[PDB]
Amino acid sequence: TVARDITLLECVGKGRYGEVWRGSWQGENVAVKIFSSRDEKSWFRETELYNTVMLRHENILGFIASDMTSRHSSTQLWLITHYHEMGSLYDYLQLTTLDTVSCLRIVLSIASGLAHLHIEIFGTQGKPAIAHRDLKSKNILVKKNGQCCIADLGLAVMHSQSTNQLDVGNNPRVGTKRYMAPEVLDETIQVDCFDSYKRVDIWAFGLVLWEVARRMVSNGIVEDYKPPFYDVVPNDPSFEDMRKVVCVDQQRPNIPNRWFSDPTLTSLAKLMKECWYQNPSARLTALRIKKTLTKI
Numbered sequence: 001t002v003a004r005d006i007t008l009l010e011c012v013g014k015g016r017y018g019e020v021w022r023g024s025w026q027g028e029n030v031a032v033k034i035f036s037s038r039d040e041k042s043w044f045r046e047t048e049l050y051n052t053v054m055l056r057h058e059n060i061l062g063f064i065a066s067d068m069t070s071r072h073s074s075t076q077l078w079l080i081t082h083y084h085e086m087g088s089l090y091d092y093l094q095l096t097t098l099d100t101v102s103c104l105r106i107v108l109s110i111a112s113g114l115a116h117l118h119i120e121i122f123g124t125q126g127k128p129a130i131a132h133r134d135l136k137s138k139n140i141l142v143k144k145n146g147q148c149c150i151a152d153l154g155l156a157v158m159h160s161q162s163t164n165q166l167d168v169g170n171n172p173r174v175g176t177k178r179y180m181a182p183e184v185l186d187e188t189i190q191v192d193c194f195d196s197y198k199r200v201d202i203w204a205f206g207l208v209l210w211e212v213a214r215r216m217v218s219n220g221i222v223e224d225y226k227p228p229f230y231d232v233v234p235n236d237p238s239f240e241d242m243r244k245v246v247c248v249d250q251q252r253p254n255i256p257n258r259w260f261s262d263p264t265l266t267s268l269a270k271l272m273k274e275c276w277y278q279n280p281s282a283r284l285t286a287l288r289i290k291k292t293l294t295k296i
């Protein structure tokens with residue numbers, strides 16, 4: 001097993017989900033995710049998706065290996081992937097501002113990744129439709145070429161037209177509350193319809209677009225990095241803080257006036273508002289977003 005050969009060097013992420021370490025393996029950095037004992041269904045789901053489906057795409061965090069090892073006198077579940085030293089989009093947006101080309105590169109490569117997940121590919125070399133269910137800026141990494149890749153398939157849902165079998169797994173984990181779509185927060189989401197989960201992804205992608213656009217300079221200014229709904233919920237908002245803001249008060253992120261004086265940001269403002277329709281079926285698709293961003 002690889003697990004015992006990897007040298008863990010420093011912790012680069014920690015939460016209720018577990019930890020991620022920068023590790024050394026075969027003379028290279030690798031990312032090692034060590035799952036909390038409470039989150040093993042996530043490791044199960046990610047391993048399934050990376051080893052059984054062979055998910056591989058330039059805008060999807062690149063799988064290396066999945067492993068069971070016992071360190072420190074207990075058995076841990078490890079996921080090992082490429083390590084992106086630029087870190088998460090969430091951190092990246094805090095340490096730098098963006099020009100037009102860099103902003104569009106970022107958001108388009110996210111669209112590319114999410115389209116690839118959402119769309120079914122038939123044949124000997126293919127994949128079922130996949131919905132992410134926890135898309136956020138901390139689950140997006142920034143590559144050295146300035147594109148991004150989507151990470152954390154632990155909540156993935158799958159569907160194939162071959163079988164008409166919706167596969168939601170058995171994970172008790174739920175999405176990051178700050179990013180939950182209205183229909184999740186008010187528990188009217190249609191849980192047996194695969195499209196529902198794609199539309200939850202599109203809502204969260206809209207929020208990520210907002211986070212990114214704020215950091216694009218126009219007429220010499222930018223907004224500070226903030227997370228969606230920073231102004232109306234505390235850190236680590238409860239399910240009820242979000243339900244009140246998003247469902248009862250029907251809040252959406254505010255568009256800064258200066259965006260309408262720049263054409264790219266105007267275009268992006270139009271997109272993100274069409275990810276935020278309360279009616280889930282009215283929201284844009286990943287492929288549509290991808291197509292529009294390509295033209296901008």
Ligand SMILES: COc1cc(-c2cncc(-c3ccc(CN4CCCC4)cc3)c2C)cc(OC)c1OC
Binds near residue numbers: 020031081083085141
């Ligand atoms: C193994 O599994 C996963 C690894 C990663 C992952 C991959 N590459 C790099 C990183 C990272 C490296 C360094 C920093 C620190 N910053 C500060 C300033 C610059 C760098 C942040 C993040 C991480 C977390 C992410 C996952 O999900 C979110 C994983 O779970 C699927």
